[PDB]
Each structure stands twice: as structure tokens, then as C-alpha cells.
């Protein structure tokens, strides 16, 4: 046939072709989250959009290194240094530092999350941008682990609306990765998600991440159609565009036929 038939039952992921000035990296918005609140972030509605009802603390733009690896301080005999959680022991010390005098359960202030001065012990953040596939095919996004709660969404009308990156979050709970902290205290079951993507189209991408106490961890990767994996640093893959709600042709509902 002269043309491709298109993905079955209109199943292709919606993408965009914003015509404005492209900027490298993703925008990160920070929102209030209560220390030791282990319930709020277990709700899908909260993780999809409810987070933005809380106080907005600030933002940073142009971020290409997007994994989270926040370690709390150990106030030790030789000074105060961050402690890798796997090196924490007893009640409590940090291997190579001796006993720590400080509490694991209070808020700590730091610029570790994207250079923004906040409380990485207790915070919710929203990463937005567009993912640009260099190759046509199946992409598998992954979280290596989640502490405390997280989602990843890809696609127009799922992550956000085309050419409307800066708008209040949309209500879709159709997550690409559901890493929401289970109520049952369990581990989130599936922390990978696959999307078929067409080279050169801009795919809206949203990551919402929350921490309630102490350590925070979110190692983000993507496996490309060629089988290679990009981890942590998504430079060359992720971009931002200022809103242009007047660009009529910005949405591509079916890139499999466009
Ligand atoms: O914590 C999120 C990001 O913050 C940035 O300031 C760091 O340079 C990155 O290594 C990290 O992925
Ligand atoms: O409530 C779960 C908590 O368990 C602790 O072992 C982790 O270190 C915290 O970072 C986590 O938030
Ligand atoms: Ca829509
Ligand atoms: Ca934590
Ligand atoms: Cl030690
Ligand atoms: Na860590
Ligand atoms: Na520290």
C-alpha cells in the first residue's frame, strides 16, 4: 500500500512538533511535602496532579542530569558528610565515619536536587520536557528503585498537552511507569514502561517524584531501540519549549501516519 496502515485502534502515542525556540533540558518544579507523611504520596490523583495544589517552592530549568540520589548528613567526629544509605548501620553510624550524632528523622536543607535550596528529605518535584527519539522503535523507560514514590508519563494528553509544557498539570493517571508507594507497604510491582516512538517527534515527558523522610532515590534510565541504555544524563534527548497555545498544528495525534 502507498501509505502505512497506522497503529491499530488509533493506538499510537500522541506527540508534538513545537515550532518555537528549543531549549536543552527539563524544567523542575518543587512543591511542599510534609516530613514523615507516608500516606499522601500513595494516591494516584496526588502523584498525577494533586501535588500542584500545595505550595510551590520554586523551580529550575534546563536540567539534563535527572536521576535523584540524595543522602542525609552524618554529623561525625571528623565533620559533616553525606552518608550512602547502604553504609548506614546501627543507631546510627556511617561506615568510615563512626557514630553519627544527628537524627535520621528531621528535615535537612541542601542544594542536592538540581542546585535548588530546599528540603530533599521532604519534597515533591515535577520534571517536564519533551523526549526526542533519535531512532524509530520501542523505548523502555525504567526506575532502578523508588524511594519514596514516583511516576513517569510519556505522550501528548498523558504527560501534558502539546505546546503547553508550562500549564497546570493535566489529570491523566495513565502512567508509563507506576512507581507509587503501595499502601500495603510493599514494593511497587512494575517499575519499567515501554513506548513506541517515531524519530524526530517531540514526546511530552513528565516525572513526579516524592520523598517523605531521609534518603531519596530515583535512578532513571531508558533503553533505546538499538538496545543501548542511557542512564541519569539525558543530554541530547530532553528539551523544553515555552508555551505557545496558539500554534494550531502543534499536536500530532498519530505519528504513525503523519
Ligand atoms: O538531584 C538531581 C540532579 O541534581 C543536579 O544538580 C546534579 O548535578 C545531578 O547529578 C542530579 O541528577
Ligand atoms: O518509609 C520508608 C523509609 O524507609 C527508610 O529505610 C528509608 O531510608 C527512607 O528513605 C524511606 O523513606
Ligand atoms: Ca488532549
Ligand atoms: Ca525516603
Ligand atoms: Cl565506621
Ligand atoms: Na544514595
Ligand atoms: Na551533608
Whether residues 25 and 99 fall in one domain: no
Whether residues 143 and 45 fall in one domain: yes
Ligand number nearest to the C-alpha of 253: 3
Whether residues 58 and 90 fall in one domain: no
Whether residues 199 and 225 fall in one domain: yes
What domain range includes position 85? 71-104
Whether residues 100 and 126 fall in one domain: no
Whether residues 215 and 88 fall in one domain: no
* Closest CA to ligand 1's atom 6: 114
Whether residues 185 and 238 fall in one domain: yes
Three state DSSP letters for the chain: CCCCCCCHHHCCCCEECCCCCCEECEEEEEECCCCCCCCHHHCHHHHHCHHHHCCEEEEEEEECECCEEECCEEEECCEEEECCHHHEECCCEECCCEECCCCCCCCCCECCCCCCCECCCCEEEEEEEEECCCCCEEEEEEECCCECEEEEEECECCCECCCCCCCCCCCCCCCCEEECCCCCCCCCCCCEEEEEECCCCEEEEEEEEEECCCCEEECEEEECCCCCEEECECCCCEEECCCCCCCCCCEECCCCCC
Whether residues 179 and 92 fall in one domain: no
* Closest CA to ligand 2's atom 3: 213
CB within 6 Å of ligand 1 — which residues?
Answer: 65-68, 112-115
Pocket of ligand 2, candidates 35, 123, 124, 148: which has the most ligand atoms within 8 Å of its Cβ, to mutate?
A: 148
Experimental method: X-ray
Amino acid at each position: 500500500g502507498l501509505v502505512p496502515r497506522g497503529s491499530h485502534m488509533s493506538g499510537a502515542t500522541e506527540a508534538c512538533l513545537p515550532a518555537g525556540q528549543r531549549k536543552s533540558g527539563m524544567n523542575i518544579n518543587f512543591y511542599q511535602y510534609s516530613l514523615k507523611d507516608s500516606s499522601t504520596y500513595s494516591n494516584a490523583a496526588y502523584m498525577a496532579y494533586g501535588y500542584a495544589s500545595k505550595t510551590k517552592l520554586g523551580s529550575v530549568g534546563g536540567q539534563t542530569d535527572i536521576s535523584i540520589d540524595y543522602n542525609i548528613p552524618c554529623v561525625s567526629s571528623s565533620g559533616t558528610f553525606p552518608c550512602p544509605q547502604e553504609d548506614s548501620y546501627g543507631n546510627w553510624g556511617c561506615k568510615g565515619m563512626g557514630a553519627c550524632s544527628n537524627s535520621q528523622g528531621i528535615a535537612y536543607w541542601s542544594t542536592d536536587l538540581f542546585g535548588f535550596y530546599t528540603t530533599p528529605t521532604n519534597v515533591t518535584l515535577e520534571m517536564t520536557g519533551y523526549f526526542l527519539p533519535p531512532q524509530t522503535g520501542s523505548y523502555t523507560f525504567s526506575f532502578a528503585t523508588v524511594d519514596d514514590s514516583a511516576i513517569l508519563s510519556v505522550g501528548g494528553s498523558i504527560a501534558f498537552e502539546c505546546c503547553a509544557q508550562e500549564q497546570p498539570p493535566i489529570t491523566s493517571t495513565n502512567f508509563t511507569i507506576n512507581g507509587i508507594k503501595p499502601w500495603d507497604g510493599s514494593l511497587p510491582t512494575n517499575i519499567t514502561g515501554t513506548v513506541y516512538m517515531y524519530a524526530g517527534y517531540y514526546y511530552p515527558l513528565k516525572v513526579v517524584y516524592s520523598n517523605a523522610v531521609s534518603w531519596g532515590t530515583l535512578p532513571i534510565s531508558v533503553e533505546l531501540p538499538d538496545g543501548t541504555t542511557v542512564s541519569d544524563n539525558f543530554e541530547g534527548y530532553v528539551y523544553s519549549f515555552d508555551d505557545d497555545l496558539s500554534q494550531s498544528n502543534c499536536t500530532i495525534p498519530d505519528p504513525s501516519i503523519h
